[PDB]
Amino acid sequence: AKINFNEKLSQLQTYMIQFDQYIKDSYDLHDLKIAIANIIDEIIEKLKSLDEHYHIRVNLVKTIHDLHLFIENIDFNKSGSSTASWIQNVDTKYQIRIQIQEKLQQLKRHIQNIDIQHLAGKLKQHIEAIDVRVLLDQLGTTIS
């Protein structure tokens, strides 16, 4: 029984060694994902031309600015609840609507700085930053 148990323990140790070896010798897909990011830049190249051929980004930025202007133009003075509309005159003496307009324009400039280019760049950065080889090495070394 002792010899059989020792044989079983040796077999389990050999299996664990083989499993660690197989884990270590599998890092091909990590390249593929990086390669995926490469093809993304190709789309970016297309992007780098598409606006210059379509001006879609210019139209969308104009649309965002126009929507923000319409939102800023909504006048609460002549709306319902006329007594609450007096609060608007309170805004006249408390620069509240000015703060609202400033926050809306800050949101506008933040969104207009968020385009497809930044999304593609950040996606490529995240794809290339994640390195599964280090994770596999840590998993195979810590576990024993």
Q: What is the chain written as a DSSP string? A: -HHHHHHHHHHHHHHHHHHHHHHHT--HHHHHHHHHHHHHHHHHHHHHHHHHHH-HHHHHHHHHHHHHHHHHH--SSSSS-HHHHHHHHHHHTTTHHHHHHHHHHHHHHHHHT--HHHHHHHHHHHHHH--HHHHHHHHHHH--
Phi-psi region of 95 (alpha: psi -120 to 50; beta: other; left: phi over 0): left
What Rg value do the Cα atoms of the chain yield, rounded?
A: 30
Q: Give dist(CA 50, CA 57) in Å, integer.
A: 9
Contacts by 28-37, CB closer than 8 A, 24 or more apart: 29/132, 30/131, 30/132, 30/133, 33/127, 33/130, 34/127, 34/128, 36/127, 37/123, 37/124, 37/127, 37/128
From the list 48, 43, 25, the residue with the least C-alpha distance to 140 is: 25
Q: Give dist(CA 97, CA 68) in Å, integer.
A: 14
Two tokens at 99?
């703060």
Q: Give dist(CA 138, CA 9) in Å, integer.
A: 24
Q: Give dist(CA 143, CA 114) in Å, integer.
A: 43
Dihedral, CA atoms, 35, 39, 42, 44, nearest 10 degrees? -100
User: 132 near 27, Cβ under 8 Å?
Assistant: yes
Q: What resolution in angstroms does the PDB record give? A: 9.0
What experimental approach yielded this model? cryo-EM
Two tokens at 3?
């010899």
